[PDB]
Write a protein that binds this ligand. Structure first.
Ligand SMILES: Nc1ncnc2c1ncn2[C@@H]1O[C@H](COP(=O)(O)OP(=O)(O)O)[C@@H](O)[C@H]1O
Ligand SMILES: Nc1ncnc2c1ncn2[C@@H]1O[C@H](COP(=O)(O)OP(=O)(O)O)[C@@H](O)[C@H]1O
Ligand SMILES: Nc1ncnc2c1ncn2[C@@H]1O[C@H](COP(=O)(O)OP(=O)(O)O)[C@@H](O)[C@H]1O
Ligand SMILES: [Mg+2]
Ligand SMILES: [Mg+2]
Ligand SMILES: [Mg+2]
Lengths: 400, 362, 370, 168, 151, 370
């Protein structure tokens, strides 16, 4: 492999985190959005991305998010997003560098195939590793890079903008049969905040204002009928949020029960959706109880949080208490049949200083390894087998 | 030759059979179902489904005198259907004992047995035992080497012709004791026990169709090479008097029917019934029964306004895609008697992959 | 399927994409009681909509939320849209995309509030706003022509050549069937009959819809009516008393050809059509003249197509064939062409979607619906 | 385009239309299943002989045929390295859409640029004369499509040259 | 692991092409002599300018077999050379007077020619294909699809 | 058979060597839509070329890639060449050697770039670039003469004696048919007709082709047209409107004899032709005067050969005959002569072959062609 630093690109549904292996942060963290125009033809040169795309809606560009619900679904826009990432922001030559890419555990064979042909034929990268994204978020949880600080067994709950998935990993191996996914994350709680501002007919219900009300005003409560009652009993529970309009004037928004009812989307997904029903503490139980019996203590002892939509105030404490309730009720059913007390299991949900970008920090830490260039597809593999080299699922069991 | 389109089925129709009075017909759709159609004035109405098969139904046949339907499928089964006094149909599974799909089925002329062709290198000759209340199956298996594509019964109840994907047409004894009385001496033989082989006639391509002459004294068969061969036997262990092949200029015939002792109608991938005429001195393609072989401002409705914009949007232009000149728009799969005494078929029906059921008058 | 809602100034016309005609057609009216509600219970309501307002009208003040193609009252327009979805079509609007319509040269805010109410009040999955004359050209089976569309509140001309609109040549005229109804009230007053209330304005609209017609030569018809009983005929009011009228039958529609009858300084609908053709580039004019398409209820008068052809033949050079296309279904051609458009497969990519509105706000309509 | 291609595309049309005499056929090697037999090859009696139609050493068809399936594969004109890149990538976008063009393969057979599989079901559910019209209209136009793409590439190479060289 | 071991190839031997098509009733040196008598007649008919009689005589016998590729390719060299020397105006009058078996042999050997363009001129074979299919119909190609694999 | 193209400055003439006339003759134009397509499912294309651009011109801006015989837009020239091959002649460019054609005294880059595009973009097997005036002698059956060739973009004189060209006596004049269309648009304005757009220019080109002629004595014709309406004619626009035309009917073509009408300091076509003969060696002049060949569309005016013989007879010494050969097919004589040249057995070693180009680069054309 080349001696140049690998380039790390976590392309999320909400945000892309771009940087180089071994740095103390991503070089860029900006929305996974493209601004596109809607006698020589140049409208495919005229686009913008990230923070510079958000500035272009008033100039008549159509904004789009080429990743939705965790999966790339517009390969024209994702190719233009990557070329602009590589040549504007990272300012790099693909021929000199190995790349770490990411996508959700479910992601189609078709997506890794389409990713490999853009990377090896459009850009001609030296080599590509498409990582299992929340497996990197386990490695970001270490107290330091030294081997004695590693905890190679843990459940990881990743919750970004587009999807939340719970991954069991034990001794560094991903138990792919036990992956659970909930199709609801940080964007669906924004659409719920937006919908509640809109039901009150508030002066502003733009998407940025609903987003900023999540980041600043929202938190996870114990129980929504007790918390609705606390919003009768105590008057300063309602906040006032000052927002500036697209046409440049002030507004003031009263923010109310969406402060607790919007983060409740994870703990009662029947608020968000007709199609998904199991709450996150029961969904994490289903991951560990489908997983092999000898790893269950290790998977409960280390439940790592990952992705921006896990950062709600009191989120890890609600998950820990509700999962500890599920776990001890199941252990006590067995103690009451057997007539003897167990040792129990400690359920620990872990929030940590790198939790916001744990996939990128893990990708950086794993791409720093001396062995890394041997796990990549090299362009010499792609010259023989084409994009079919990337098609086989890494995380799940394959037939053949 | 006059033609009348009786009905347009919503899905392909590899087989159909009318009852003896031509007052209802049964057809295999391309699914696991079978459709029963009754008259509705001059039209037809979907009376009921049968759906006892698991996989695609391949063939269906209706016994004239005894009023029973037999059905075959890629599920390897057959069902016999018999009419109840209240007007519903009693299904009955027949244990064919086939390793692969049932491909083709025919009732015998006396209707006391039927035969099922298969992809399993064998034919299940099925008969009923009153001592057990069972349909039971005998396997013809000795010379057969590939999928049996079609069957026909001799006018005497014993001999079965079979068209095979090994490029051969077989004549085999399907004689069953305590069902058949002894067969009369014939040009095919007289010592005639089960699975004795009366002929193994060659073809240039897969034998899609077989058919005995109305007297039984000759066999016509049609190959995927777009030929019809007519075989005139001499005796057991002796080569035929004549083995006359007529080679057509069109796509292959899939189905075949003697109009009289000196004429055959045939049809298939050419989308059109042809007439062949001849005898043991020679045979010739003599007519096409479909005139379509010759390749032959006012107020406008909402469905024409909307479809011309959908055609502009989805396709190249407003202009609708034209019909083929033949009445059938796709291959015509089966060809069956409709009127006239046996030996003088005056009208016949066809059904096709386009779902048209069509009546032809000679 | 998708809803098509041609919410015009005088009639709401609504239904489903791919249907032969609108299955909901009702007055674009909200009615409110103007009298002492003395009996307790009695099935009384705070307001009434459409045919319910039109049948109760003797006790109601009637008002249209839409005038000159512009929504003037959004609270009553939501009341009308609710009546379309829940009462008249009997659908969940959150289950169906909706094709809406408006006249060209409308205020920008009309399109914005119309998209906002569809996504935020009616919770629609997707919507689009079409220009009404562009829809009427699909209903003609044509991809070139000039469409003269005249409804209740607005008349407009849109020229299209081979699917390209010429937006500089588009004409609007804020004169159509409501101005003709108001003028028929003003001239009925001269023969003896006063119609004054918002309820009596519906009686004289019904007189206009079956007594009135367009003269081929106005001064000859005016002289023929001034000298004979033969142009005069009668109508019966709800009260059973009879109205007889004569030259009022063709003086009312003549205001489309002579807007000065209502004090307007504008060309008539014939000369406005010719001025739109003459604003187009010289090579396209021949095919516009051969394709003058009539639309909307104010084009339903007897003799108006024969008059429009006579008048445009005098303005155009004699060297070419003027043809006026006036289908008997032209009462609904905007809705008919909306049901064509909403059923095309490329149009399924042209919808504003819920997710895309939520990301962009109501300004998304100005950068997607033209 | 068809003056130079006319003899070739008439031979392709005639033999593709002869080859599409397809039928429902279940497997002789697997029970309760059917497979496109040209694509599996496990029972040779229901395979028809493979036919090559050719204009040139570089411009060729392979027609492979069976009781229930035809596989049709083509080599297309690539007279320079720009055309080798442009053709390969255009066929990859076209085969990436194969679910919506129901008679496309997702991969070409080795030594061919694009490939088609027409099965029994396609001849039952689609107009088969319009299937062979789509094959021949694709073969008629693809050389004009690819040559126009190398004009667009030339036109962009001029755009960046003039934009660059005009800002000294 | 067991999944990849081919048991079917040894427990259920499939049909061979000689189970479908009858064995050639002539030896390799017997057919090689029969063609070696015809090729000199086919060459000689070009020199007298009678290439139509060159085809009519060459077409009177055809070699087949997987044991005879050398004499099959020599016969194909003579066939394409004969077809290249017939004038394009003579083809319609010659094709209508061929038997169905001679037509079947012509359309078979223009197909063997079209399979190898670095040896054979496709332009004349496509001109022959157009005229043979126009006059004798689609069924002549259907007979080539159905034909023996060692022709 | 070879291909032959006169890529003229106004028309493409294309076809096969040994044929009597061009197979394809069409406008050397690319048109692009100026308006927005409002109609879904229409046959909307990114650009149109030739007769399809000319047919659709009412919605297109029209551009010519060739100006004054120089290719100014290589992308639109490549679109025209792609259209000649794949749509008009419908042959693949790799299959036939192509005879292209050029005016004398062009930029050397024009011919190199034309060579590079044929060998590397269209991958032609061999090609050649002939001088348009040399081909006009092949069509005329001459090996001696002076050719006055005048197309849409350039007028040029080439004197040739017994197969030898005199390249010092060659004259170019960047004034031909397009400059006469520009001037007719300008002098139509003074009778009150306004032609401004790129499509109205094509109507004025048709007015010039249908009605203009060369006046044998301009001041007698100006006095005649001032005295009576007998010189006036009428033309009907695509709008069905009629325009009437008078002295501007012959004052337009007079710009060939008086270039100062369009403000340019140069000799008229008679004086450049005489100056070309007077630059030749004294013994050959006597034979050049008898062999004036006229070619191209701007030599098609009624009366131009009579005017040209009158003016050359006034310049030349009266002791010897002036004869001008202006044949009725002269509109296509460059292409006809290219079909003759590319058909000669003695020409088949003169092609630049692809194998001979890619050992030398596109400068090969300057040593294989004149
Ligand atoms: N403090 C916070 N509290 C709650 N949600 C947050 C917070 N900070 C960021 N988010 C939300 O996290 C999501 C982005 O997380 P990220 O991990 O970058 O998602 P992704 O990788 O899928 O694009 C957005 O919905 C964002 O608004
Ligand atoms: N037969 C008719 N004769 C004259 N006017 C008519 C006729 N039918 C409808 N109208 C008038 O047309 C108007 C309604 O037309 P419509 O196209 O539905 O308008 P809108 O779309 O703007 O609501 C009303 O003024 C109505 O009275
Ligand atoms: N009959 C005519 N009378 C006058 N001018 C003509 C006539 N025919 C064509 N033209 C002019 O000549 C041009 C075409 O002549 P042509 O020799 O083909 O020019 P070029 O080779 O440059 O394309 C036209 O575009 C027009 O300007
Ligand atoms: Mg994410
Ligand atoms: Mg209206
Ligand atoms: Mg020229």
């Amino acid at each position: 492999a080349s001696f140049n630093v690998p380039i790390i690109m976590d392309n999320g549904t909400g945000y892309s985190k771009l940087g180089y292996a071994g740095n103390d942060a991503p070089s860029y963290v900006f929305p996974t959005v493209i601004a596109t125009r809607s006698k020589r033809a140049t409208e495919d040169l005229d686009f913008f991305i990230g923070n510079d795309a958000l500035k272009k809606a008033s100039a008549g560009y159509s904004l789009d998010y080429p990743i939705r619900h965790g999966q790339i679904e517009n390969w024209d826009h994702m190719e233009r997003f990557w070329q602009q990432s590589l040549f504007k922001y990272l300012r790099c030559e693909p021929e000199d560098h190995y790349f770490l890419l990411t996508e959700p555990p479910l992601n189609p064979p078709e997506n890794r195939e389409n990713t490999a042909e853009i990377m090896f034929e459009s850009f001609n990268c030296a080599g590509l590793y498409i990582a299992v994204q929340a497996v990197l978020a386990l490695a970001a949880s270490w107290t330091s890079s030294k081997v004695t600080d590693r905890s190679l067994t843990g459940t990881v709950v990743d919750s970004g903008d587009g999807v939340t998935h719970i991954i069991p990993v034990a001794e560094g191996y991903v138990i792919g049969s036990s992956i659970k996914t909930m199709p609801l994350a940080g964007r669906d709680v924004t659409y719920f905040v937006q919908s509640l501002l809109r039901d009150r007919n508030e002066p502003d219900s733009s998407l940025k204002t609903a987003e900023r009300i999540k980041e600043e005003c929202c938190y996870v409560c114990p129980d929504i009928v007790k918390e609705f009652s606390r919003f009768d009993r105590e008057p300063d529970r309602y906040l006032k949020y000052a927002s500036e309009s697209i046409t440049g004037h002030s507004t003031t928004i009263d923010v109310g029960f969406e402060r607790f009812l919007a983060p409740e989307i994870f703990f009662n997904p029947e608020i968000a959706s007709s199609d998904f029903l199991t709450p996150l503490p029961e969904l994490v139980d289903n991951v560990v109880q489908s997983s092999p019996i000898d790893v269950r203590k290790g998977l409960y002892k280390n439940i790592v949080l990952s992705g921006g939509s896990t950062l709600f105030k009191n989120f890890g404490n609600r998950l820990q208490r509700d999962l500890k309730r599920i776990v001890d009720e199941r252990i006590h059913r067995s103690e009451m049949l057997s007539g003897a007390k167990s040792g129990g299991v400690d359920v620990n949900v872990i929030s940590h200083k790198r939790q916001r970008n744990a996939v990128w920090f893990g990708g950086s830490l794993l791409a720093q390894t001396p062995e890394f260039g041997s796990y990549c597809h090299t362009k010499a593999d792609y010259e023989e087998y084409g994009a079919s080299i990337a098609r086989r699922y890494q995380i799940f069991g394959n037939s053949l | 030759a006059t033609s009348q389109v009786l009905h347009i089925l919503p899905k392909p129709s590899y087989e159909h059979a009318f009852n003896s009075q031509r007052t209802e017909f049964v057809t295999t759709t391309a699914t696991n179902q079978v459709e029963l159609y009754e008259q509705d004035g001059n039209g037809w109405k979907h009376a009921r489904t049968f759906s006892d098969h698991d996989k695609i139904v391949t063939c269906v046949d209706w016994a004239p005198k005894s009023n029973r339907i037999v059905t075959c499928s890629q599920d390897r089964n057959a069902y016999v259907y018999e009419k109840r006094p209240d007007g519903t149909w009693k299904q009955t599974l027949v244990l064919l004992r086939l390793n692969r799909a049932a491909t083709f089925v025919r009732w015998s002329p006396n209707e006391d047995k039927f035969a099922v062709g298969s992809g399993a290198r064998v034919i299940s000759v099925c008969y009923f035992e009153q001592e057990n209340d069972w349909w039971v199956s005998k396997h013809l298996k000795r010379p057969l080497r590939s999928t049996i594509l079609s069957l026909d019964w001799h006018p005497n109840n014993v001999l079965l012709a079979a068209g095979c994907a090994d490029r051969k047409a077989y004549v085999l004894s399907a004689y069953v004791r305590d069902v058949d009385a002894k067969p009369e001496a014939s040009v095919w033989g007289s010592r005639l026990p089960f699975n004795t082989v009366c002929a193994e006639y060659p073809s240039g391509g897969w034998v899609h169709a077989v058919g005995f002459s109305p007297s039984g004294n000759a066999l016509a068969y049609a190959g995927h090479d777009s030929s019809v061969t007519i075989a005139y036997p001499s005796a057991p262990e002796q080569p035929p008097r004549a083995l006359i092949t007529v080679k057509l200029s069109q796509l292959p015939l899939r189905s075949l029917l003697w109009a009289n002792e000196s004429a055959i109608v045939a049809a298939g991938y050419n989308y059109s019934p042809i007439l062949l005429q001849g005898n043991e001195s020679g045979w010739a393609h003599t007519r096409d029964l479909d005139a379509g072989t010759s390749k032959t401002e006012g107020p406008v409705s909402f469905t024409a306004l909307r479809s011309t914009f959908r055609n502009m949007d989805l396709k190249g232009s407003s202009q609708s895609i034209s019909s083929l000149p033949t009445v059938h728009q796709n291959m015509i799969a089966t060809l069956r008697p409709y009127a006239g005494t046996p030996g003088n078929i005056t009208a016949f029906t066809s059904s096709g992959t386009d779902g048209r059921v069509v009546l032809w008058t000679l | 399927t998708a809803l098509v809602c041609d919410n015009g100034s005088g009639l709401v016309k609504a239904g489903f994409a791919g249907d032969d005609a609108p299955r909901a057609v009702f007055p674009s009216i909200v009615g409110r009681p103007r009298h002492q509600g003395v009996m307790v219970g009695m099935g009384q309501k705070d307001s009434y909509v459409g045919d319910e307002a039109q049948s109760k009208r003797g006790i109601l003040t009637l008002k249209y939320p839409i005038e000159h193609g512009i929504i003037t009252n959004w609270d009553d327009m939501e009341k009308i849209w609710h009546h379309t979805f829940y009462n008249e079509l009997r659908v969940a609007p959150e289950e169906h995309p909706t094709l809406l319509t408006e006249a060209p040269l409308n205020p920008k805010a009309n399109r914005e509030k119309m998209t906002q109410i569809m996504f935020e009040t009616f919770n629609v999955p997707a919507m689009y706003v079409a220009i009404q004359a562009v829809l009427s050209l699909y209903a003609s089976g044509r991809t070139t022509g000039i469409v003269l569309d005249s409804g209740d509140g607005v008349t407009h001309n849109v020229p299209i050549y081979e699917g390209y609109a010429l937006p500089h040549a588009i004409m609007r005229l804020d004169l159509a069937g409501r101005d003709l109804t108001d003028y028929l009230m003003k001239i009925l007053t001269e023969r003896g009959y006063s119609f004054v209330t918002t309820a009596e304005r519906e009686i004289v609209r019904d007189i206009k819809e079956k007594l009135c017609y367009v003269a081929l030569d106005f001064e000859n018809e005016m002289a023929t009516a001034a000298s004979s009983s033969s142009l005069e005929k009668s109508y019966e009011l709800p009260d059973g008393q009879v109205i007889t009228i004569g030259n009022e039958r063709f003086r009312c529609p003549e205001t489309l050809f002579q807007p000065s009858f209502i004090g307007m300084e504008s060309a008539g609908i014939h000369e406005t059509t010719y001025n739109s053709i003459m604003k187009c580039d010289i090579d396209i004019r021949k095919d516009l003249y051969a394709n003058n398409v009539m639309s909307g209820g104010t084009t339903m008068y007897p003799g108006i197509a024969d008059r429009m052809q006579k008048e445009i033949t005098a303005l155009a050079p004699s060297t070419m064939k003027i043809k006026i296309i006036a289908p008997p279904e032209r009462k609904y051609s905007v809705w008919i062409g909306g049901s064509i458009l909403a059923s095309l497969s490329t149009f399924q990519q042209m919808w504003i979607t819920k997710q895309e509105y939520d990301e962009a706000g109501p300004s998304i309509v100005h950068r997607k619906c033209f | 385009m068809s003056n130079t291609l006319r003899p070739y595309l008439n031979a392709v049309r005639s033999t593709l239309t002869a080859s599409l005499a397809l039928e429902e056929f279940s497997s002789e090697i697997v029970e309760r299943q059917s497979q496109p037999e040209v694509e599996v090859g496990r029972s040779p009696e229901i395979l028809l002989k493979p036919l090559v139609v050719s204009r040139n050493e570089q411009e060729q068809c392979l027609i492979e045929s069976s009781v229930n399936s035809v596989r049709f594969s083509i080599r297309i004109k690539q007279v320079d390295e720009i055309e080798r890149i442009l053709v390969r990538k255009f066929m990859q976008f076209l085969m990436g859409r194969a679910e919506s063009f129901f008679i496309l393969r997702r991969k070409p057979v080795q030594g061919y640029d694009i490939s088609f599989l027409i099965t029994n079901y396609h001849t039952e559910e689609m107009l088969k004369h319009k299937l062979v019209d789509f094959i021949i209209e694709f073969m008629e136009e693809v050389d004009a499509e690819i040559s126009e793409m190398k004009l667009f590439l030339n036109g962009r190479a001029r755009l960046v040259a003039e934009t660059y060289l005009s800002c000294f | 692991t067991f999944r990849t071991l081919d048991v079917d190839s040894i427990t259920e031997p499939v049909l061979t092409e000689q189970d479908i098509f009858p064995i050639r009733n002539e030896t390799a040196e017997q057919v090689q002599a029969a063609v070696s008598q015809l090729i000199p007649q086919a060459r000689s008919a070009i020199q007298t300018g009678n290439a139509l009689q060159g085809l009519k005589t060459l077409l009177s016998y055809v070699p087949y077999g997987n044991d005879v590729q050398e004499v099959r390719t020599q016969y194909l060299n003579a066939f394409v050379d004969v077809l290249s020397n017939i004038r394009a105006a003579d083809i319609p009058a010659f094709v209508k007077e061929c038997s169905t078996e001679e037509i079947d042999n012509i359309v078979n050997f223009i197909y063997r020619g079209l399979a190898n363009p670095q040896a054979y001129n496709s332009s004349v074979l496509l001109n022959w294909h157009e005229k043979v299919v126009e006059i004798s119909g689609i069924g002549c190609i259907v007979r080539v699809l159905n034909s023996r694999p060692d022709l």
